[PDB]
Design brief:
part of a larger assembly, 1 chains, about 210 residues, alpha/beta, 6-stranded mixed β-sheet, 7 helices, about 40% helix, Midasin, motor protein, Ribosome biogenesis, AAA protein, Mechanochemical enzyme
């Protein structure tokens, strides 16, 4: 291995689609599985935010310093058990955008890449907001990762159609452009991927590793 100084914020969806237990459990437990199994070394730490209709910081980078804090605090931070929210993308984005990056920037006084991991199931109700959110991230040199839930909490046939329908509509109505949602992810480096479950994480980590590298 070799030097890779950076810090990471992980933002986990707390909207209505997370109301199915499969979505919340796998997303939060996996973050916890990773964190617990992870040599969360000096190279970079993890800050975690929850977000629905509004973002909530669950904890700062160095707050749940001990994995034990995570062992108990995942319950402390239980996501809505029966979720009825929407994703206020613009706010969730600006909250972690400003917080994680500013905190990292000041906190460590060093050569740290700013990475944000986005865990959600797809297109947001206000995805149009991306044109500015993207703009801001670009200007500020902020790196992101987008993990797309298969439109969880909707019939599997609908997980597909809900997102493809936006595309289908995009094709006819010249007003519309699905691209704005995928757009936020500059996939040349800031790759995004639709997944079924937590076992696609090794792909992410590995792809991300090369981006962690350089």
């Amino acid at each position: 291995p070799s030097k890779r100084t950076y810090q990471v914020m992980i933002s986990i969806d707390d909207s209505k689609s997370m109301s199915e237990s499969g979505s919340t459990v796998l997303a939060l437990e996996t973050l916890a599985l990773v964190t617990k199994a992870l040599s969360l070394l000096e190279v970079g730490q993890i800050a975690v935010m929850k977000f629905g209709e509004q973002p909530e910081l669950l904890h700062p980078f160095d707050k749940q310093f001990s994995s034990e804090s995570g062992v108990q605090m995942f319950s402390h931070f239980t996501f809505e058990q029966s979720n009825t929210n929407v994703l206020a993308l613009a706010d969730a984005s600006m909250k972690c955008f400003n917080y994680a990056n500013t905190a990292s920037h000041h906190r460590s006084n060093s050569d740290i890449r700013q990475l944000e991991i986005i865990i959600s199931d797809g297109i947001c109700e206000d995805h149009d907001s991306i044109r500015k959110l993207l703009r801001r991230a670009q200007e500020e040199k902020v790196m992101i990762v987008f993990v797309i839930l298969d439109n969880v909490n909707t019939q599997k046939k609908s997980s597909i159609l809900d997102i493809k329908k936006v595309y289908y509509d995009t094709k006819e109505d010249g007003t519309m452009d699905l691209k704005i949602q995928p757009y936020i992810d500059e996939f040349a480096f800031d790759y995004y991927l639709v997944v079924r479950n937590i076992e696609e994480l090794p792909q992410l980590l590995s792809s991300a590793l090369r981006q962690w590298f350089q």
